[PDB]
Amino acid sequence: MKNDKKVVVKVKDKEMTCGAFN
Amino acid sequence: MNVGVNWSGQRELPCINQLFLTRDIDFVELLIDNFLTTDVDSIKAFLAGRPCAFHIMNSQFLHKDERELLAMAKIINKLIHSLQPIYISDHIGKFYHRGQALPQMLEVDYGLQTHSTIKKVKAWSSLLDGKLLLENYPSIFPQDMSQIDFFKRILEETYCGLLFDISNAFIAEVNIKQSRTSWFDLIKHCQHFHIAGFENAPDNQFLVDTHSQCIEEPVLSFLQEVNNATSIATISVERDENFDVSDWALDIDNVRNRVS
Amino acid sequence: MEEILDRIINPLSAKPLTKKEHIYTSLVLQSSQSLILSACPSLQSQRQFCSFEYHQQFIDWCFFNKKRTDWCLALSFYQYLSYKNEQVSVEILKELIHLACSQWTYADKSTNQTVVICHTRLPSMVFGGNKSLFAQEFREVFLLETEQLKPFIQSHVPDGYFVYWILRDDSEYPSTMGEK
Ligand SMILES: [Fe+3]
Ligand SMILES: [Fe+3]
Ligand SMILES: [Fe+3]
């Protein structure tokens, strides 16, 4: 966007996968 | 038999890159609906000549009318045309209950309004460029209609086929006592397969389809039964957690050795 | 069964479940709590927010008020915390917005590349997420300090509400009214 003053941040998550959660 | 692996994102890329350097990976099954805004040439660069197949996780097509799916079918079909997957495939899954989104894909009620579900199968598959394969669910709870009888109707009344997940069917046998035997009539008309590891639920109440461990001996012995019963064109050795290259490579080795 | 499904979306009923059914419903519910806890370490500043029973109360409140439990779950969780507590640190708000933007890039199945999210508490901050655009590149969760949407958020967003926009890319600020 036009205030190109931006910070990229980490998020500890994960994409959709076929593997169920345990 | 082409032996491949699944690719759903970037977390596993270091591990896949290691697999590419130490093993023969004959094809890669993309979870294609995770790449819908991805530059296709960047995908081809990564594959470096290896063929691919498509697996669709979150169309959620049983929750939608045909018209809601048009936009997704358009993107997927462009990716089908550019990447020429060996097969395309989706799931029979439940993603909502009473309008609330579920945190996991749950098993469908096969016997409830079976004809409306067959109609959604026809509608979705008719919008995709190719024969849609549907994957069997790793049942946790029993119900009135067998998953086998459900898929028999899919294969008889629609243009769809079966993507047979060997460990999912093993999980259902353990969890709900669905004899693996019942799949062998359908298996004989299937050439594309999945196999993976799993984990025990707390207090060993059921097996969870985690794709996070190595394939256990009873599942490999089930694999050999499948190999005796039909033609295995392709099998994807799945992994979604614990991206240890040695464990994934051990699975790939064991799958190849078991059918030799 | 529909009783197992009911307890997944409406967990605080006392209707009995067998051990297997209870461990399954708890397992499914645990997955959405893990997503929140893994991605928002600031929640450890308030250990009461982190119990599984607190999560169950949160999901039950989401059922009674039909709050979204998809990629907007993290936003729903902030609204629950506001509904229950007199104050919540801005770092929890920020991490939950970051989580929602991340989860958007995994859940939205369109050609649109970008979500932008704002909240009334931070009128001079624009949060966003960009889907991966290249095979080996991660999805991008970003933050902008800007007054560009501050007039729109004080005049057109009631206090306590989030507002979000889906955009084809991240070249332009949203022009329109978004959702919520
Ligand atoms: Fe699958
Ligand atoms: Fe599978
Ligand atoms: Fe599986």
Residue numbers in the entry:
A (entry chain F): 1 to 22
B (entry chain A): 1 to 260
C (entry chain D): 1 to 180
What does the study report here?
To understand the mechanism of how MbnBCs catalyze modification of MbnAs, we finally solved the crystal structures of VcMbnABC and RrMbnABC at resolutions of 2.2 Å and 2.7 Å, respectively. In VcMbnA, the C-terminal half of the LP (residues 13–16) and the CP (residues 17–23) form a curved structure that docks into the catalytic cavity. This presents the only cysteine residue (Cys18) of VcMbnA at the apex of the curve, coordinating with one of the iron ions in the catalytic cavity formed by VcMbnBC. The divalent ion (Fe1) coordinates to VcMbnAC18 in VcMbnABC and to RrMbnAC25 in RrMbnABC, providing direct evidence for cysteine modifications of MbnA by MbnBC. In VcMbnB, the residues coordinating the iron ions are His55, His91, Glu135, Asp165, Asn168, His194, Asp209, and Glu238; this is also the case for equivalent residues in RrMbnB. Glu135 in VcMbnB provides a bidentate carboxylate ligand that bridges Fe1 and Fe2. The L2 loop of VcMbnB harbors the conserved residues Asp209 and His211, which are critical for Fe3 coordination. The main chain of VcMbnB Asp240 forms an intramolecular hydrogen bond with VcMbnBH211, while the side chain forms a hydrogen bond with the amide nitrogen of VcMbnAG19. Mutation of VcMbnBD240 to Ala, Glu or Asn had no detectable effect on VcMbnB’s interaction with VcMbnC but slightly impaired VcMbnA recognition by VcMbnBC. However, the mutation abrogated enzymatic activity of the VcMbnBC complex.
